[PDB]
């Protein structure tokens, strides 16, 4: 949570453990590349879990997760999605973002 942290950690990092009123303020430690990330500075002792790009959803990875940037998905070859956000892609019936 961080109510007792005086100092933030920058993107890509997290507090080693929760701050407390008596403990020496914990150092920042890096998120696990490929697994977790923080795209924004924060006062917490947790990173966020990298999302997945599930094939069964017609997705694949476009950019792998980095310590500071959540995974970026895209449609698979021959699938497409109209909306700006795409919980999934459907088979071209065409760009990865358009249907023909």
């Amino acid at each position, epitope marked *: 949570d961080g109510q007792f942290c005086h100092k*933030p950690c920058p993107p890509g990092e997290r507090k080693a453990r929760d701050c407390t009123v008596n403990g020496d303020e914990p150092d920042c430690v890096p998120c696990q590349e490929g697994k977790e990330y923080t795209d924004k500075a924060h006062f917490s002792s947790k990173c966020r879990r990298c999302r997945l790009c599930d094939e069964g959803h017609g997705l694949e990875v476009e950019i792998n997760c980095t310590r500071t940037q959540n995974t970026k998905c895209r449609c698979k070859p021959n699938f497409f999605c109209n909306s700006t956000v795409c919980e999934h892609c459907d088979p071209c019936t065409c760009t990865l973002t358009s249907n023909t």
Partner: antibody
Amino acid sequence: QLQLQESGPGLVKPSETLSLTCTVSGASISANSYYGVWVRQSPGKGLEWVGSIAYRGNSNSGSTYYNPSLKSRATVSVDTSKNQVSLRLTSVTAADTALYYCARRQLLDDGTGYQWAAFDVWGQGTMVTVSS
Amino acid sequence: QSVLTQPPSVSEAPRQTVTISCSGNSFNIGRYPVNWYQQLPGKAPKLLIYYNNLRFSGVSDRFSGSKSGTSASLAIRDLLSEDEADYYCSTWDDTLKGWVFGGGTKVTVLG
């Protein structure tokens, strides 16, 4: 809801200790936790954060963090029975003349799980002049 | 100078728009979100924008904030006389290991 009110002597002499009080109303600073700060403003000039206390009512203790440029001249503390946070500044000089504000630091949601800190409630400010 | 640089003054006619820049470096804005405070003549600062672009409770949607790289920006559209005030940006600085504020920007609605 929360309201803050600063008070203290308006004139202090150099080498002497400056003492200020910040009185919390509309809530109890010992109910849960309370993060208080002091911020000062030399007349016609900008803002400068002085220091902080992160205070936990149930253990009646807080931890402090100070602006390094104050060279350890600043201390902040809590008097829970008066709902007050205080500032003490030692060895003051002319450069310490300023409007002194107290404020609360709150972790604010962004609506997507993230929080960031801001000074969301401020006192009215008390003016302090340092002169021999 | 403050580690965050703001123009001392911006202005425009009523109903127009002004933009206030706030520039830092890789150890402050480059890493951390920016908050903005509004200080009316003779009053204390109050929270205006937090976390780059979120309006604090009560704040008019005429105020908007953004951040890019090592700079942040506050824009006030459809200006009214009541908007005349000093505006301060603020963030954490890892070189100084503390909270920092820009030097402040006075807004004038040209009369």
